[PDB]
Write a protein that binds this ligand. Sequence first.
Ligand SMILES: [Zn+2]
Length: 153
Amino acid sequence: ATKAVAVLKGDGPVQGIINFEQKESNGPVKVWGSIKGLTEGLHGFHVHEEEDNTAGCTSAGPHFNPLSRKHGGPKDEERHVGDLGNVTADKDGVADVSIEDSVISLSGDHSIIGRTLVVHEKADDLGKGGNEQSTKTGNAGSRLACGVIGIAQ
Ligand SMILES: [Zn+2]
């Protein structure tokens, strides 16, 4: 209890707010967020490193790769320990950032709090290996909006 915010803006013509809350620390986070301005259709939804950069992105590459994680969507068994998967945007570019993972947290350390959430150009791969960058990171396509997570109580 106590919410983190990620105001996602980055650089693309997108604007949104993640509201991260959970009962516990060691328990499943209830992600809800109301992102808009995306292009239509599927959009990868990944949390890259990028802590104390400036405010938003400046800096990050992979989906918080500790050494050699593999990609996977929600449905997959695996994932980088900074990807959830994707969302779908309607037409006002409005996505529905409703996720409930059981691996991450919003406490600290292995939590994703502090990290830069990113909304991406294409769908993520889901862990099929459409190509290869697929498994290596997730082949989301380019970064659009982003922001450091944690900015509430
Ligand atoms: Zn990934």
